């Protein structure tokens, strides 16, 4: 079974000597710490609110910053959010669109600041 | 003792331990596979007696590497994080087949290890049945273990090449030594007694009759080693709990309700 946050075919395996810490044992399709990631997805559907894929760059080239980042943890939408699980935001670097917004985006470093830029992921 | 606490995706709090807890856990779990490292840290107050410990093994095309680190000072957990032995997990059906991809420890001081956890019905623990890998745990060079009517744990740890290949370890592989213990798991005092708990027939290396407890208030008795009965083991033998008062002695009815 799963009941640990193990999305999809996730299997919950724990670890006695290491303080019942858990990890999920993912099937091929779903990567990430909960099997939260559909790594087959190549386009996004509609607006993106659902998109859990793995676009990580932006429409100029630049790479996305990790929802982890010490940088990003000041920004409102980031991986520590109490809600972050259901919105796709996690220890990755991908694109999401948790609030509203035409397509999926991510926090991009440019010079010094952290602008929110728009991802690549082609629409269907 | 003040010490940062925080599960996986959480931010950290300044937790602050009570009389009993005097160390600061900083467990990290990592995985590599097809150049994707993903690493999950949890921190919090530790306890009286836990030990800088390390484990790693491989399931399929990946390596998971658990490590634990403790210290007895204020917020000493914070922001930032060779010898061959057989490997495999029960999970991917690899420790059970007469074949199992192997591995080589990356720290001197590491060991070779087999860890067994066998549980019945809807089992309280999400732990592989059999695991073989590299690393150091409580009371290493040597062995620990304890069996109950419905449960059987056992560790084995050695400083010699592939010291852990060959046959796995079931129940029947142990010589009913002849000595006995008790097995109890209901609730509090009257879930089990001289009435709803019976004498187990102790098996081989197990010869210590043992009890366990913690505060809602879970309790367990049976047949164990002297290494098991000592150190961190027993404690983690179940989800979480107190100072988990624990007891050992010689005798068949050693562990009968006192
Ligand atoms: C009791 C003991 O061995 N404590 C060590 C200490 O000597 C060392 O300075 C520190 C390095 O971070 O790790 C801890
Ligand atoms: C070796 C042995 O006696 N095992 C039994 C198991 O078969 C039984 O189903 C369980 C009751 O839950 O208690 C114990
Ligand atoms: C558990 O912890 C404290 C340590 O401060 C101890 O004094 C207390 O009696 C223990 N509880 C028991 C043995 O029930
Ligand atoms: C545990 O780790 C610390 C710091 O990481 C190290 O200095 C210390 O010696 C270790 N504990 C023991 C008891 O050796
Ligand atoms: C343990 O292994 C080390 C090297 O890993 C070696 O120097 C030593 O001879 C070994 N000793 C024992 C008792 O296993």
UniProtKB/Swiss-Prot annotation, chain A:
Listed name of the protein:
Urokinase-type plasminogen activator long chain A
Residues shown, of full length: 29 to 152 of 433
Q: Which cysteines are joined by disulfide bonds?
A: 4-12, 6-24, 26-35, 43-124, 64-106, 95-119
User: Where in the numbering of this chain does the Kringle domain appear?
Assistant: 43-124
Species the sequence originates in: Mus musculus (Mouse)
Q: Region entry Binds urokinase plasminogen activator surface receptor: which residue ranges?
A: 7-30
Q: What is the lineage of its organism?
A: Eukaryota, Metazoa, Chordata, Craniata, Vertebrata
Domain EGF-like positions? 1-36
From Swiss-Prot, chain B:
Sample GO molecular function, one term: enzyme binding
Tissue specificity, per the record, is:
Expressed in angiogenic endothelial cells (at protein level).
| Recorded coiled-coil stretches | none
- Indicate the quaternary assembly: Monomer. Interacts (via the UPAR/Ly6 domains) with SRPX2. Interacts with MRC2. Interacts with SORL1 (via N-terminal ectodomain); this interaction decreases PLAUR internalization. The ternary complex composed of PLAUR-PLAU-SERPINE1 also interacts with SORL1. Interacts with CD82; this interaction prevents PLAUR from binding to its high affinity ligand PLAU.
Provenance organism: Mus musculus
Q: What is this protein called?
A: Urokinase plasminogen activator surface receptor
Entry's Gene Ontology cellular component terms: external side of plasma membrane; extracellular region; plasma membrane; protein complex involved in cell-matrix adhesion; serine-type endopeptidase complex
Q: Which UniProt keywords apply?
A: Cell membrane, Disulfide bond, Glycoprotein, GPI-anchor, Lipoprotein, Membrane, Receptor, Repeat, Secreted, Signal
- Report the record's disulfide bonds: 3-24, 6-12, 17-45, 71-76, 85-112, 88-95, 105-134, 140-157, 158-163, 181-209, 184-192, 202-223, 229-248, 249-254
Biological processes, Gene Ontology terms: negative regulation of intrinsic apoptotic signaling pathway; positive regulation of epidermal growth factor receptor signaling pathway; positive regulation of homotypic cell-cell adhesion; positive regulation of release of cytochrome c from mitochondria; regulation of cell adhesion; regulation of fibrinolysis; regulation of plasminogen activation; urokinase plasminogen activator signaling pathway
On the tree of life, the source organism's domain of life is Eukaryota
Which residue range or ranges hold the UPAR/Ly6 domain? 1-83, 83-178, 179-258
Please tell me where this chain falls within the complete protein, as first and last residue plus total length: 24 to 297 of 327
Q: Which residues are glycosylated?
A: 9, 52, 149, 159, 187, 243
Q: Report the function annotation for this chain.
A: Acts as a receptor for urokinase plasminogen activator. Plays a role in localizing and promoting plasmin formation. Mediates the proteolysis-independent signal transduction activation effects of U-PA.
